[PDB]
Design an enzyme around this catalytic site. Structure first.
Site, mmCIF file in Angstrom:
data_model
loop_
_atom_site.group_PDB
_atom_site.id
_atom_site.type_symbol
_atom_site.label_atom_id
_atom_site.label_comp_id
_atom_site.label_asym_id
_atom_site.label_seq_id
_atom_site.Cartn_x
_atom_site.Cartn_y
_atom_site.Cartn_z
ATOM 1 N N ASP A 197 -53.809 31.924 16.888
ATOM 2 C CA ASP A 197 -52.783 30.933 17.162
ATOM 3 C C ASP A 197 -51.596 31.042 16.206
ATOM 4 O O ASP A 197 -51.774 31.276 15.013
ATOM 5 C CB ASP A 197 -53.388 29.532 17.049
ATOM 6 C CG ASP A 197 -52.357 28.438 17.255
ATOM 7 O OD1 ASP A 197 -51.845 28.317 18.386
ATOM 8 O OD2 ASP A 197 -52.052 27.710 16.283
ATOM 9 N N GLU A 233 -50.921 35.371 19.399
ATOM 10 C CA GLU A 233 -49.900 34.655 20.154
ATOM 11 C C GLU A 233 -48.570 34.803 19.430
ATOM 12 O O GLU A 233 -48.343 34.207 18.367
ATOM 13 C CB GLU A 233 -50.196 33.158 20.289
ATOM 14 C CG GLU A 233 -49.121 32.443 21.111
ATOM 15 C CD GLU A 233 -48.679 31.118 20.513
ATOM 16 O OE1 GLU A 233 -48.842 30.927 19.294
ATOM 17 O OE2 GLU A 233 -48.149 30.269 21.258
HETATM 18 C C1 LIG Z 1 -45.757 25.341 20.817
HETATM 19 C C2 LIG Z 1 -45.327 26.713 20.280
HETATM 20 O O1 LIG Z 1 -44.139 26.544 19.437
HETATM 21 C C3 LIG Z 1 -43.576 27.729 18.834
HETATM 22 O O2 LIG Z 1 -42.968 28.469 19.868
HETATM 23 C C4 LIG Z 1 -41.549 28.560 19.779
HETATM 24 C C5 LIG Z 1 -41.142 30.038 19.874
HETATM 25 O O3 LIG Z 1 -41.723 30.781 18.814
HETATM 26 C C6 LIG Z 1 -39.623 30.151 19.775
HETATM 27 O O4 LIG Z 1 -39.234 31.515 19.837
HETATM 28 C C7 LIG Z 1 -38.910 29.350 20.905
HETATM 29 O O5 LIG Z 1 -39.160 29.995 22.172
HETATM 30 C C8 LIG Z 1 -38.532 29.389 23.337
HETATM 31 C C9 LIG Z 1 -37.331 30.232 23.890
HETATM 32 O O6 LIG Z 1 -36.188 29.338 24.032
HETATM 33 C C10 LIG Z 1 -34.952 29.929 24.542
HETATM 34 O O7 LIG Z 1 -33.860 29.023 24.453
HETATM 35 C C11 LIG Z 1 -34.538 31.175 23.696
HETATM 36 O O8 LIG Z 1 -33.430 31.826 24.308
HETATM 37 C C12 LIG Z 1 -35.726 32.187 23.605
HETATM 38 O O9 LIG Z 1 -35.328 33.302 22.809
HETATM 39 C C13 LIG Z 1 -36.923 31.469 22.963
HETATM 40 O O10 LIG Z 1 -38.020 32.378 22.843
HETATM 41 O O11 LIG Z 1 -39.393 27.963 20.876
HETATM 42 C C14 LIG Z 1 -40.848 27.795 20.986
HETATM 43 C C15 LIG Z 1 -41.169 26.270 20.993
HETATM 44 O O12 LIG Z 1 -40.928 25.679 19.728
HETATM 45 C C16 LIG Z 1 -44.653 28.562 18.089
HETATM 46 O O13 LIG Z 1 -44.118 29.820 17.718
HETATM 47 C C17 LIG Z 1 -45.926 28.769 18.947
HETATM 48 O O14 LIG Z 1 -46.902 29.399 18.144
HETATM 49 C C18 LIG Z 1 -46.465 27.370 19.409
HETATM 50 N N1 LIG Z 1 -47.691 27.536 20.235
HETATM 51 C C19 LIG Z 1 -49.115 27.510 19.581
HETATM 52 C C20 LIG Z 1 -49.223 26.735 18.249
HETATM 53 C C21 LIG Z 1 -49.628 25.447 18.032
HETATM 54 C C22 LIG Z 1 -49.680 24.887 16.673
HETATM 55 O O15 LIG Z 1 -51.054 25.141 16.282
HETATM 56 C C23 LIG Z 1 -50.051 24.606 19.306
HETATM 57 O O16 LIG Z 1 -49.439 23.353 19.345
HETATM 58 C C24 LIG Z 1 -49.920 25.381 20.675
HETATM 59 O O17 LIG Z 1 -50.862 24.830 21.558
HETATM 60 C C25 LIG Z 1 -50.160 26.945 20.495
HETATM 61 O O18 LIG Z 1 -50.115 27.594 21.726
HETATM 62 CL CL LIG Z 2 -51.644 32.064 24.425
#
Ligand SMILES: C[C@H]1O[C@H](O[C@H]2[C@H](O)[C@@H](O)[C@@H](OC[C@H]3O[C@@H](O)[C@H](O)[C@@H](O)[C@@H]3O)O[C@@H]2CO)[C@H](O)[C@@H](O)[C@@H]1N[C@H]1C=C(CO)[C@@H](O)[C@H](O)[C@H]1O
Ligand SMILES: [Cl-]
Ligand SMILES: *[C@@H]1O[C@H](CO)[C@@H](O)[C@H](O)[C@H]1NC(C)=O
Ligand SMILES: [Ca+2]
EC number: 3.2.1.1
Length: 496
Positions: A197, A233
């Site tokens: 994660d 991820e």
């Molecule tokens: C919930 C997840 O949040 C983070 O993801 C970020 C991502 O890393 C970041 O690049 C951006 O991406 C969206 C996208 O938006 C567009 O406007 C741009 O042009 C694109 O270039 C861009 O990629 O925002 C998201 C959301 O904040 C974390 O990096 C990711 O790890 C998170 N997911 C996991 C982690 C947790 C915390 O333990 C959980 O809540 C979740 O269930 C996990 O899957």
């Molecule tokens: Cl995933």
């Protein structure tokens, strides 16, 4: 780290999101094993913060309090029971490892945890591990708020708090050791791999140092020298300084561009059309197939929470969802993961779902058991997409055609395409606003085949559409744009 460790002939894993260990154990024996599923990704099995406002949201499970196997899914005995029964039936278990952080820095100190463990975020104290102020990156992060403020600065993305989550100092051997202690406990129990994660938020080198501390898989079920399957991820849609290729040395990576583009193509957004999928794969700028973990939607973006946006297809969009999952499972690129969800009362306001926090079906916070209906669907609000005939049959299709090359491609220059996998399978899609009626070369041996989307092969007979392949491999296909499922799939094992 790159091999799934699944039983030979099983090519997909399913994410049984928020399921209880006892229900998964039963599912391994009564469905997953018999239907050819390779494994299951489980929700975080370690103790998390019990959040009551909002009422027990799914995301409270991503706020660790300790590494005790004690959650709303069950205790350690039930967890070990599930892994053993599933392994004895040839179905692997993959753990969602939340190792980048502990809970939110603003969470109240106390014992509002799923196992009663005491914790104090304010003073950085997690005695159940134990962790103290010396184990977090507070002194390393350089932003004014202490949180990640800009994803264009690769340093703060790794050293600062993801939306307030206390960031572990993964460079310290002590911390690396406590995490490895947790993961080795699971490996020795019998898990086959992990979903790391928030990998984007950890330095590739720190992850590797941790992986070097891991045991080989349990020799009671796996051949000597087996290494745990690792998929990280990392959301990489381009435009950011961090690239998923930076993590290839540790294992596979989640390819989020996959679901995002498949969604826009199938929805036919902005000129996109299925005929363009001819060179689907690395040809679209995706990571190498042997480092990819693909999926249509995940527990995050199916509720508009991660990356993918409005284009993402989910069970809510049933008809188009089955087609997207169908294409994914038939196409040779990457290792496939099937999503299995629960329904929640989506309530959109100004284009946003205000109930995107709602946790799994429950009674006073106690997760409801998965009940099976006489027609094999699920009750208690569990969607069970993995049980939908169209999806379950395509999981088998991938098994049957495993190893076969992508061939006999056809497209009408619009949204009617078809292709086969060697001489073991063939699939046809009609996503145009008119009917499809054409004879195509399938590459399959002559015979009568059951269409596995509309029906099943019930020994000697088909319950749905039947296709007749002639001696030269040709077969006629007829798909109305009004069909419940606008696509047909036949394979070596659906032959009469
Ligand atoms: C919930 C997840 O949040 C983070 O993801 C970020 C991502 O890393 C970041 O690049 C951006 O991406 C969206 C996208 O938006 C567009 O406007 C741009 O042009 C694109 O270039 C861009 O990629 O925002 C998201 C959301 O904040 C974390 O990096 C990711 O790890 C998170 N997911 C996991 C982690 C947790 C915390 O333990 C959980 O809540 C979740 O269930 C996990 O899957
Ligand atoms: Cl995933
Ligand atoms: C197929 O079903 C019909 C009845 O609908 C039956 O007469 C026939 O024997 C079945 N074929 C086989 C091979 O069992
Ligand atoms: Ca970090």
């Amino acid at each position: 780290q790159y091999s799934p460790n699944t039983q030979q002939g099983r090519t997909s894993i399913v994410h049984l999101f928020e399921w209880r260990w006892v229900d998964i154990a039963l599912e391994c024996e009564r469905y997953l094993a018999p239907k050819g599923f390779g494994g299951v990704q489980v929700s975080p099995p370690n103790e998390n913060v019990a959040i009551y406002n909002p009422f027990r949201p799914w995301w409270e499970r991503y706020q660790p309090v300790s590494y005790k196997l004690c959650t709303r899914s069950g205790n350690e005995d039930e967890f070990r029971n599930m892994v053993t029964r599933c392994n004895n039936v040839g179905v692997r278990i993959y753990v969602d490892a939340v190792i980048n952080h502990m809970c939110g820095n603003a969470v109240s100190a106390g014992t509002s945890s799923t196992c009663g463990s005491y914790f104090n975020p304010g003073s950085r104290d997690f005695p159940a591990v134990p962790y103290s102020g010396w184990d977090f990156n507070d002194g390393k992060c350089k932003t004014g708020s202490g949180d990640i403020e800009n994803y264009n600065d690769a340093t703060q993305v790794r050293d600062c708090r993801l939306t307030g989550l206390l960031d572990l100092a993964l460079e310290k051997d002590y911390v690396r050791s406590k995490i490895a202690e947790y993961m080795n406990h699971l490996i020795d129990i019998g898990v086959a791999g992990f979903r790391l994660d928030a990998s984007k938020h950890m330095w590739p080198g720190d992850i590797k140092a941790i992986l070097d501390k891991l045991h080989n898989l349990n020799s009671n079920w796996f051949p000597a020298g087996s290494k745990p399957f690792i998929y990280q991820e990392v959301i990489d849609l381009g435009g950011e300084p961090i690239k998923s290729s930076d993590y290839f040395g540790n294992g596979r990576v989640t390819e989020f561009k996959y679901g995002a583009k498949l969604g826009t193509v199938i929805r036919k957004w902005n000129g996109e059309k299925m005929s363009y999928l001819k060179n689907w794969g690395e040809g679209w700028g995706f990571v190498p197939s042997d480092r990819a973990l693909v999926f249509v939607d995940n527990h995050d973006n199916q509720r508009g929470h991660g990356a993918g946006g409005a284009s993402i297809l989910t069970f809510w969009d049933a008809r188009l969802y089955k087609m997207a999952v169908g294409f994914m499972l038939a196409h040779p690129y990457g290792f496939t993961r099937v999503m299995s969800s629960y329904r929640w009362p989506r309530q959109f306001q100004n284009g946003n779902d205000v109930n995107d926090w709602v946790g799994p079906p429950n009674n006073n916070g106690v997760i409801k058991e998965v009940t099976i209906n006489p027609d094999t669907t699920c009750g208690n609000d569990w969607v069970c997409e993995h049980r939908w005939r169209q999806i379950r049959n395509m999981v088998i299709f991938r098994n049957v055609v495993d190893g076969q090359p992508f061939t006999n491609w056809y497209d009408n220059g619009s949204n009617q395409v078809a292709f086969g996998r060697g001489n073991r399978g063939f699939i046809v899609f009609n996503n145009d606003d008119w009917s499809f009626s054409l004879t195509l070369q399938t590459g399959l041996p002559a015979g009568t085949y059951c269409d596995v989307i509309s029906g099943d092969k019930i020994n000697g007979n088909c319950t749905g559409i039947k296709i007749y392949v002639s001696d030269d491999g040709k077969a006629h296909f007829s798909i109305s744009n009004s069909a419940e499922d606008p696509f047909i799939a036949i394979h070596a094992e659906s032959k009469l």
